[PDB]
Amino acid sequence: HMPCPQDWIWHGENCYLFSSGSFNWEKSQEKCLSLDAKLLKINSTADLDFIQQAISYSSFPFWMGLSRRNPSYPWLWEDGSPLMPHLFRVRGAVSQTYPSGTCAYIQRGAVYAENCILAAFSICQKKAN
Amino acid sequence: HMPCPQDWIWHGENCYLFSSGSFNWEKSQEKCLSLDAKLLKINSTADLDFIQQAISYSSFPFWMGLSRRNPSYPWLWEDGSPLMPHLFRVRGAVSQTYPSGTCAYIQRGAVYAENCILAAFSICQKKANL
Amino acid sequence: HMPCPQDWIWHGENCYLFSSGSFNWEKSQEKCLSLDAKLLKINSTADLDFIQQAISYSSFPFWMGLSRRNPSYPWLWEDGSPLMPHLFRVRGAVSQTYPSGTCAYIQRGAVYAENCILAAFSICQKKANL
Amino acid sequence: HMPCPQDWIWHGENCYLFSSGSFNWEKSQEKCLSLDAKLLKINSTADLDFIQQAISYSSFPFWMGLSRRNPSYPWLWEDGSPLMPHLFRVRGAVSQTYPSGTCAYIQRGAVYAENCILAAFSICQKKAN
Ligand SMILES: CCCN1C(=O)c2ccc(Cl)cc2Nc2ncccc21
Ligand SMILES: CCCN1C(=O)c2ccc(Cl)cc2Nc2ncccc21
């Protein structure tokens, strides 16, 4: 049939969808689930290269699926898998403890840690047919 | 067996692609032709809604296929078809006469007129396999 | 000859300073004492309004002078004075008992309770020369 | 008898004031003028060091007085003075032409170019008594 639905970008084995507006991590997490998708999950250097290129026209922040309760907990994706250490280093204030947890976002090709209640753009991803 | 090639966005009956770099209108037109495509052509409110949504995360200008020789000439797409007046209003300095004509671009949901020799990003469009 | 020293914010009858790094409550209390100052003490709605405004561009937590041994003990400032109940409500896990006591912090305009050994930024305050 | 008014930070020969929220460059410029002040003007490495330190607790963008009509025009401060050579490099999409001009902003210690209709925090600066 067709690899990706309308409005989505087909890349490799996945479909990517940029959000129309800025919402908190919980709102972005919910939006992806409603479209049978998860938030952005980076599994390879090729995935990171594609995402940095697709966000090269934006100076805005983009919420990914990586998050943790506090610095004593590990960085995990929505499905419960861990982050591959070689892919990228989470910069910024990683040692801070926020009441709604610490969520990871990508901005200008770099990944930074931040409070989950902040409004930011998002990228949803799902398997391509 | 598939509506659009890789890296393109499938919408309605067209495939849309954002340009890799900022070039003048003539070079932007050439780039689309090189990918078997034309510069962005907006025919409906549903096309403008989609484009504004696709460019919502960018503060950059994106060229489209609308252009004219000078203010005394009508705004026309690359194929020669005219602009539907209800779709949108072309803002900015529309009364200016540039040596390489006046080309239109979309930025932050709004359409503005500008000199065609200015470097700007672009959106290419081509028919989807349906 | 001047109300506050360099890098401090002058407000009302006090000088406020944001800490250079994130440390546990005891180290944050020590840092203020080294600058001839104490941890943030909120005595009025005007003081709270100022602090929320000064921290409006930060998503980080800031320690204050409010702390208690456990939930059975009252919330008290460093000098021993109590909290005015109308000023604000301490949110979060207030019913928890930590080995180094429970310390209060302000983040995004709201006041939350937390373990005193956690590294957090802080606001120091001292009297202004008037 | 006081170099800076209440709520301002005294640094060197100036007074600095952080904005309470985010507004477009024109509104930020208006706010500073209302307080007998101008948008942030960096004249030395010591001024840049102070600003980066004062914004170290924020991952948000902050507006500065540096702006230009388009890439063919020079980067100028509000008073008309040019940008000093070895202070900083303006990063990002400097080759773009926005309808409301290109205004410079500081974020995470780095200076980037951007569209002036975007809402951002701001820093006002005026001489100290
Ligand atoms: C979630 C916030 C996204 N955002 C920026 O990230 C942003 C980045 C740079 C500047 Cl100067 C100003 C900015 N503010 C802003 N204004 C309007 C639309 C989006 C933005
Ligand atoms: C001018 C916009 C300021 N801003 C950010 O710059 C910002 C930075 C990072 C993230 Cl993840 C999300 C962000 N959005 C945001 N949400 C709430 C208050 C402020 C912000």
Side-chain angles (χ1 to χ4, degrees):
Chain A
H1 197 229
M2 54 195 64
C4 296
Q6 300 195 19
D7 302 358
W8 295 67
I9 305 176
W10 175 34
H11 184 77
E13 292 192 349
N14 295 307
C15 302
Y16 304 84
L17 184 72
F18 280 89
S19 74
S20 61
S22 48
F23 304 93
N24 58 48
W25 201 89
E26 176 162 319
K27 267 266 173 185
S28 310
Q29 167 180 43
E30 174 183 2
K31 186 67 170 170
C32 301
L33 294 178
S34 74
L35 302 156
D36 211 31
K38 59 206 176 186
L39 269 164
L40 179 65
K41 180 187 175 196
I42 301 170
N43 286 273
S44 68
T45 293
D47 282 355
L48 182 62
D49 268 54
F50 166 76
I51 291 301
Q52 292 168 335
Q53 178 188 37
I55 74 161
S56 64
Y57 327 90
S58 195
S59 58
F60 302 170
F62 292 83
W63 283 135
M64 79 184 66
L66 200 71
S67 67
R68 69 184 177 179
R69 177 87 197 93
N70 55 37
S72 67
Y73 278 40
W75 282 115
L76 297 172
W77 300 106
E78 293 184 310
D79 56 11
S81 57
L83 176 62
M84 279 163 169
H86 40 240
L87 303 183
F88 54 84
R89 167 203 72 257
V90 182
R91 309 164 73 169
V94 296
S95 52
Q96 307 289 94
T97 308
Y98 309 111
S100 290
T102 316
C103 295
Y105 66 103
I106 199 170
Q107 186 182 354
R108 300 194 171 264
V111 172
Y112 307 98
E114 203 48 342
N115 179 340
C116 304
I117 70 168
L118 299 181
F121 280 82
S122 41
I123 306 163
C124 296
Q125 87 164 62
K126 66 179 181 172
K127 277 289 172 286
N129 175 28
Chain B
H1 65 330
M2 54 196 56
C4 296
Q6 306 206 46
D7 297 4
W8 294 68
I9 306 174
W10 173 36
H11 187 75
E13 301 175 354
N14 305 326
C15 302
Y16 303 84
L17 186 71
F18 286 86
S19 76
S20 59
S22 262
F23 304 94
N24 61 49
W25 201 88
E26 182 171 332
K27 285 186 204 187
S28 313
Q29 172 184 68
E30 279 183 336
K31 249 295 165 177
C32 298
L33 296 184
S34 310
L35 303 157
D36 245 324
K38 67 175 179 182
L39 275 171
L40 178 65
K41 181 187 173 197
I42 302 170
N43 287 274
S44 67
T45 298
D47 281 354
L48 178 61
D49 268 54
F50 168 74
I51 290 300
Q52 294 169 333
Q53 180 189 33
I55 72 165
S56 62
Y57 56 95
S58 188
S59 57
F60 295 2
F62 296 94
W63 281 136
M64 40 162 103
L66 192 79
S67 67
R68 69 184 176 178
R69 178 87 199 92
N70 55 38
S72 67
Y73 278 40
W75 282 115
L76 297 172
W77 300 105
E78 296 190 308
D79 52 16
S81 58
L83 175 63
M84 278 168 174
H86 54 82
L87 303 183
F88 53 82
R89 60 165 195 160
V90 182
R91 307 164 145 193
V94 296
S95 51
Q96 245 68 34
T97 308
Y98 310 111
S100 287
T102 317
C103 294
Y105 70 90
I106 186 168
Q107 185 184 349
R108 299 282 290 172
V111 173
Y112 307 96
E114 205 48 76
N115 192 355
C116 306
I117 70 170
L118 297 181
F121 277 89
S122 73
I123 306 167
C124 299
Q125 86 164 62
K126 66 179 183 173
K127 276 291 170 288
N129 175 26
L130 305 163
Chain C
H1 66 328
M2 53 194 60
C4 296
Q6 302 214 11
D7 300 0
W8 294 67
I9 306 174
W10 174 35
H11 188 75
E13 301 177 342
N14 297 307
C15 302
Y16 303 84
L17 185 71
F18 287 88
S19 73
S20 59
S22 50
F23 303 96
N24 76 44
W25 199 82
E26 292 183 330
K27 284 184 191 194
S28 307
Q29 172 185 72
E30 278 186 336
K31 247 292 181 169
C32 298
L33 295 183
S34 73
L35 303 157
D36 247 328
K38 65 175 186 182
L39 268 175
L40 176 66
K41 181 187 174 198
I42 302 171
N43 288 273
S44 68
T45 299
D47 281 355
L48 181 63
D49 269 56
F50 167 74
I51 289 300
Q52 294 167 335
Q53 180 192 25
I55 73 164
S56 62
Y57 57 98
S58 188
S59 55
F60 297 1
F62 295 103
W63 283 135
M64 76 180 87
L66 205 72
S67 69
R68 69 185 176 178
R69 178 88 198 93
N70 55 37
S72 67
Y73 278 40
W75 283 114
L76 298 173
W77 300 106
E78 293 186 314
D79 54 15
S81 58
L83 174 63
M84 279 166 174
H86 54 83
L87 303 184
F88 53 83
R89 60 164 195 164
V90 182
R91 307 164 147 193
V94 296
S95 53
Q96 301 233 105
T97 307
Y98 310 111
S100 288
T102 316
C103 294
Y105 71 91
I106 186 167
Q107 186 185 351
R108 299 280 296 170
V111 172
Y112 306 98
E114 205 49 76
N115 193 354
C116 306
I117 70 170
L118 295 182
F121 279 82
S122 48
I123 307 167
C124 300
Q125 85 163 63
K126 65 179 182 173
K127 276 288 177 150
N129 176 25
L130 304 162
Chain D
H1 65 329
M2 338 155 309
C4 297
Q6 299 193 23
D7 299 1
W8 294 67
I9 306 174
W10 174 36
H11 186 76
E13 301 196 327
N14 293 328
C15 300
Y16 303 83
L17 184 73
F18 281 89
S19 73
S20 60
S22 51
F23 306 94
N24 60 49
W25 197 93
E26 180 139 322
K27 283 188 206 182
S28 290
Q29 174 185 70
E30 276 184 338
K31 246 299 169 178
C32 300
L33 294 185
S34 73
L35 303 156
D36 238 334
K38 68 182 175 179
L39 275 172
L40 180 65
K41 181 186 174 197
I42 302 171
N43 287 276
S44 68
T45 298
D47 281 356
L48 181 63
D49 210 326
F50 167 76
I51 290 302
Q52 294 167 335
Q53 177 192 28
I55 74 159
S56 63
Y57 326 91
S58 195
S59 58
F60 304 167
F62 291 82
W63 278 134
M64 80 169 59
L66 204 73
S67 71
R68 69 184 177 179
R69 178 86 198 93
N70 55 37
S72 66
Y73 278 40
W75 283 114
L76 297 172
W77 300 106
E78 297 182 313
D79 56 12
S81 58
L83 175 61
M84 280 236 90
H86 282 150
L87 295 187
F88 54 84
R89 282 119 199 203
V90 181
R91 307 165 152 193
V94 296
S95 325
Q96 307 288 94
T97 307
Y98 309 111
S100 291
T102 316
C103 301
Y105 70 103
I106 187 165
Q107 186 183 353
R108 297 198 170 256
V111 171
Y112 306 98
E114 207 31 276
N115 191 11
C116 306
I117 72 175
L118 293 186
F121 278 82
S122 53
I123 307 161
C124 302
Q125 161 194 328
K126 66 177 180 174
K127 276 288 173 288
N129 178 25

